[PDB]
Amino acid sequence: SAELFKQNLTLAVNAKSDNQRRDALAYVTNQLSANPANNPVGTVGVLTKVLPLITDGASSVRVQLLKLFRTLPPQEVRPHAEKILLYIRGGMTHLSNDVRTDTLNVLDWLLEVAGDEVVSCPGGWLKTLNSFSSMLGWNPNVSSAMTTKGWTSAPKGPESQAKQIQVLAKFLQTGFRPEEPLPYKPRAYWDNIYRLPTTPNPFAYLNLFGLPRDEDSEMYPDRMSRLRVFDMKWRAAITSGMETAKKEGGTVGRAAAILDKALKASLE
Amino acid sequence: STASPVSQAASALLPTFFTHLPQKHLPPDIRGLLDRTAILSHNQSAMLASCLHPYRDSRGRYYPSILPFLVRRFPRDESVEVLRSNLVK
Amino acid sequence: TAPPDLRVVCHRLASTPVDSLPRLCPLLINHVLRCGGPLSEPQTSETAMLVHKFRTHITSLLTGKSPAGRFTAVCLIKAVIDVGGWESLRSAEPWIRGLIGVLQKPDPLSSKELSIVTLTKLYILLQDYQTLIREMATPTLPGYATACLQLIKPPASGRPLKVPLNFVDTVAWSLSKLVVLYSTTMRPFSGQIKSALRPYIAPTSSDNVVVPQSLKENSRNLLILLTYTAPKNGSSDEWVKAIRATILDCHTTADQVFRAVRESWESTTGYHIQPVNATGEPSGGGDSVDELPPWSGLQAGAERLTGLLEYLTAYFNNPTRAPVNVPLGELLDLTTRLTLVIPPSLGAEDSIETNPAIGRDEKAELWSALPDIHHAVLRLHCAIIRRLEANAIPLATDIIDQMVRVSTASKQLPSVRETAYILAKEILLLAGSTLPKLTVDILIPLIQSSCHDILTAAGHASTASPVSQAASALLPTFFTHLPQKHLPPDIRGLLDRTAILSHNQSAMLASCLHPYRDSRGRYYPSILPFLVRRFPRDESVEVLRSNLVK
Amino acid sequence: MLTEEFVSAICGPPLSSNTAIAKDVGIYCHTLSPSYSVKSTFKKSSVPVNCLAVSDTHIFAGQHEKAYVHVYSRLRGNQEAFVALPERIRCLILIGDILVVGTTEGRLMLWEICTGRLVSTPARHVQAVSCVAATPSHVLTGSDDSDIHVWSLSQLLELDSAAEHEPLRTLANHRAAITALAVSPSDSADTNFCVSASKDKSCIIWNYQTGDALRTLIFPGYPLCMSLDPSSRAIFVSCEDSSLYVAEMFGEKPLLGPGSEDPSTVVQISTPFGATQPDVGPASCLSVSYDGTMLLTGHPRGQIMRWDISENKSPVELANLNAAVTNLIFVSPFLTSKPTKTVNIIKPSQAERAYTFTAQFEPMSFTKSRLDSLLNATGFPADALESAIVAFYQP
Amino acid sequence: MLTEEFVSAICGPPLSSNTAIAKDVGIYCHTLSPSYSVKSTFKKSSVPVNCLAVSDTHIFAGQHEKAYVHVYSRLRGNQEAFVALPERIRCLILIGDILVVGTTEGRLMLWEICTGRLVSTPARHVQAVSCVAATPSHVLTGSDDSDIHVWSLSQLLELDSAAEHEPLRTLANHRAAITALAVSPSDSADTNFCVSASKDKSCIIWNYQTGDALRTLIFPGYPLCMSLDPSSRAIFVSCEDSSLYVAEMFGEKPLLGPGSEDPSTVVQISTPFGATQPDVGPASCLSVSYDGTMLLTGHPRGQIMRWDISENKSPVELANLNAAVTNLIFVSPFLTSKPTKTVNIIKPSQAERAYTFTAQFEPMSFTKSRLDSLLNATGFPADALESAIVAFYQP
């Protein structure tokens, strides 16, 4: 059965036939749902193979990737959020609106299984804000690029915009969730020195063996620094965005209402 | 490069930022910068101080210890020989 | 908007007279070091105008007739080449020739010394930029070397040297710094340096000149590093030949020094002791170029041997260009020969074999001369340990025997005891955890002497002494790097008591980390209550308190 | 920027007909961080298990079948030396500039690469010496005779030593051939330990300076390879069941320490941290990274696995070298100041000569002068300036 | 090997009518090693429990039911001061130069004996401050309201701070009056602890910088006093049942550490290390020697009892003082070099004045020179000799 799993995954990631790919991916999803232990290549290998496929032109194939994600184990997804989030950046960036919507669904999945890892991983906050503001069109950089010097030009769907504002509001409330301390562990201080670290990807804050990080790629694990950088750099732009979405009304207005609630709780 | 007097004064101050400074009010980026400075400067006193004065997050979980770096840079120094005291019998 | 530091510099240089400018030099240097930005700015702004005026005024002071203005120019040029970077480096071509002209003209010695330091800093800083060596360092360097060798070259055989030996020290230090970087350029000057530095290698009491210690060290370093200028990559061959010639000179001097004592020493290398005439005072040396200046008298032979041993020490104190063949066997044989002759206790002069023809005054001079020679041998051993690190483990057994023999021969000299403590710390840190019972038993008097010195300095039998500091540095090593099973219980008790009374935190940590084992098997009590009560807030003491107790 | 590097050595003929991977290349030098990339190659070597040694100047590689060691210069990127040893080489490690070689006859050679001096111990092992570990003070040799011999390095290597060399202690509570040895970096008499793996499915933690057995652990399969974590907290061992086991000494049930049980009690370990598929094979060699978070395992099928202990239980394939990867050795990313540089290596020779040491003397600035303060200080020091001014104004 | 000394204070009227000891004398100073003798006496005081403090220069002794502290000059042998306080003294300790006094009205007072400041805190307590302990950063006050408050020394001793002082935390798990307090030598946030003792037959070990209660200990009688051993391994506790108990924190079963139980689970001690007869009575105060092998108790009938902790021998009577020994304080056998010596003290006054610190400055060579090396070195140094000879021969 392991050989069948490997060949079906290889055909799903390499074949030219949308129907054969969706059937192979449904087969993999069915085996993973029936038994999570039935994974010869591991969750990391499955993610590494299926993550380039999130930009596929086939919406149904993207739906079976979503189902495969939702049947993957979240505790195994959690240590490897950064690669998934980078592929999510690619999905946000790709020009197809259906690909953007399915990648928004994938981002909602990844937030559901691991919010803290996404908002604390390197580049997980400000580059996500770059992506959201770019494909909502509230980007100050894009506005400055569109604006000219001296000249004064004249001033310038619904379901997609509502989904985008909903995912942005969910990401913002996830990054600004209130946090409570754990109770006292009697043997934590000495085990921290005399035992191996149980934290996934330890020494990430050192970044000794990695590329130097700018403001965009720096980690913001805690809510206080997240709120500091957010109020320093992104408050006014998405504030104007939510006011504009409120003036639009409709389902976009409802998504603006949840966004307003989240940003008001952030201001609290 | 040679060691400037300002560098020597800062190196003598680096362990004190761990030993005699409240780490619960310290931002995580400054703690990371201090740990990077200690590791890349090979300050065994600062690495021992960082191991013995761990950083609590907002969650309450301690950060991983520098100790794998200290034991590989100074394997037979008194700083690690005192940490190996649980096997003395 | 130029810096206020630059405005202050320009205004004070414009207003202050040149005769009072040297008194104003300390604040001007601080202001120039504050001026980091505009001086490093490559080539209109007031910053650029003031920088151009400042450089023009520097050049005017350097080319002016005023020696005070020249001194101020040297100080400002040193500051500018320190703070301004590559632009200040490339805008300094007339400055190098002006600094050499300061050396050539009859300027005062402080100005000449600061010019030498500034030129050495310039030639060192030009090594980073490969082209500036070609346009700038290469043409100007032979003139600087010629000026320095003219300053330190003796004017005549019947005339003394004009420049002070402290200035010869500065010249030798500058050439020592420049040979490692510009071997090809100053290859032709190697002949004059070897003739100029000949009296200062091993000066004796017969030279009638008090040679500075720093001059001796710098001359030794320069004549060792002069192998860099050897043509056709003869650096290693010249280094090996020179160090073997130094060992041979040590042996030939030691013959005339030790003509009184009949030696049982034999050579593994094969050197045989030449016969020495019984009549007359012991003499050595010649007027030849390769050999050192002559000396007369047994004491002068002793300082000659001490200076040659310090030159051998400088060999391990100086780096080499290429891999070299270090004669460790010959050095070990030489040190064994010099350490097998030892001063006696009170009344053992009859016990030690002596030549009948040698008089009592010459004998007493010899036994006074031996401790300094043993001290020089121990310093040479310390240098060998420091340079080789784990490569002197093959030599570890013999140096222990020589150190114990020298210390037991002269345990009343504080300098010999301090050097024995330093060498003991180095050897025990190197290979000490595997010493046998016999070696541990024969190094016990060193432990007793160290504990006695520490307790005497602590007052529980004084003040701070170098011997006390060396013994306190050695004290934790007796716990960390010595076999505790081979130690007698009284020695361990003395060590623990000495550590407690001296409040030595490192020694007390080591004693708590190394419990003592007897033949019976009973746990001796630790000194942990003393350590926690004297150093309560120390981090390592906290770890010991939380670990050893559990 | 810190880059972590490792040197791999392969043995045997190629197992697949791939024109991209050259057959005759035996040694690779790689970067693990920030990504996999082959820096350099070294030619014509078939290096079995535990016959590779890496130092900042040279790579020593004992040869399968032949009684030869190939010495490659990392500085010049070439094969410096073909050295022939008197007997078959089974294991080879390097301490300092002294190469420890354990033979099939049971002998140990200590070869000093700078002085060109070879010291041969008597055959105290009745069969082949399988594994050897070293400290600056001790050498531990575990062999196929179910015996581990502890030797004093300072006693083994001396000038004019003619007495036959004898081990200080012998640890023989094993009952099978010793597969692996690892030694804690501590040299103290009370805190040091070693951990040994043998073919009787057992690993014993010993105090090799006092000759006491601290702990006994039993695995379902006999351990092929072992490495301690850098911080001495845990042991990572591979087994013949293609499994990777972790053993932490200071957990809730501690193997060592004050809370540990009696040394006579034997711990059973049956929970595997990881497992490799049989098409990859059991881990022939293992190494641990500088931070200790990652460990590399080499398999005789040709694959290299990277294991992230915190992140992913399943290994991640770096590459396939098309030959049995017998050795993986990590290199420290930090440059260590060593007072001598071994540029060239003196071949072993048996002749009468004075003890000569061959190395390049680096600049460490052991000599300090008062002119150096003026030279290395920005500007001049204030006392130097004011002394110069006073002597200038004085006639 | 050491000469240990200890100071005792008596309280109340003499119990026996006729004795060799003078009825006037209230403070005794004795030498314990090598022989027991009364080295000195101090005349008139009636010191309650925990109302004595000893420094290198002075002895501070609170009076019974009075707002008076008698200060005796230990370097002169007489009584220097009769310092009055606004409120009566329940307890007092000395740290550095600050006398910390817990009063009868629930107030904390800090008298700086070198400047004259008397900083008073608002009455956070509702009853009398029973016991007080001090770290270099914190002050813990346990009162009869079953409350212990932790204060920070810097914000207590700030010069121009006019805001009301407030405790950082309130360690309130006890249910009765806090009898005793002891503090670990450590001051780090994660390695410190403090042990309380209250009238609910309980002792709680807290971390006084985080507020967590690490351990709860039940004694058959309510504790009177404790003392930590010098190694912070054992807590010697006197109880109402005329018994001294030893609670070993880190022994075969760790109260604190990795092998401990939950903090909620309570450990009961029922094994008495020592017992005293009913005529002796329960020990009013406990103290441990500098070595830690020896322990002293004060008993209300006047006798001081020496107990051998190591040998576990029977206690022996040193002398009888005919009055209740309320306070026994050991003096460190070694002398610590203190930068300033407090020869005289300044009485507390509330007036508009500049901040003046009054002490004597001791010579400890804060300055150095080339001539100081010439003076201190035996003979002259060789370099200075050489420079002198060169300057002499220079024309």
Swiss-Prot record, chain A:
Q: Describe its function.
A: Component of the RIX1 complex required for processing of ITS2 sequences from 35S pre-rRNA.
Q: Which UniProt keywords apply?
A: Nucleus, Ribosome biogenesis, rRNA processing
| GO annotation, biological process | rRNA processing
Q: What is this protein called?
A: Pre-rRNA-processing protein IPI1
Subunit text: Component of the RIX1 complex, composed of IPI1, RIX1/IPI2 and IPI3 in a 1:2:2 stoichiometry. The complex interacts (via RIX1) with MDN1 (via its hexameric AAA ATPase ring) and the pre-60S ribosome particles.
- From which residue to which does any coiled coil extend? none
Domain of life of the native organism: Eukaryota
Q: Which residues of the full protein are shown?
A: 56 to 330 of 338
What family does this belong to? Belongs to the IPI1/TEX10 family.
A GO cellular component term found in this entry reads: rixosome complex
What gene name is listed for this protein? IPI1
Q: What is its main location?
A: nucleus
Q: Where in the cell is it found?
A: Nucleus
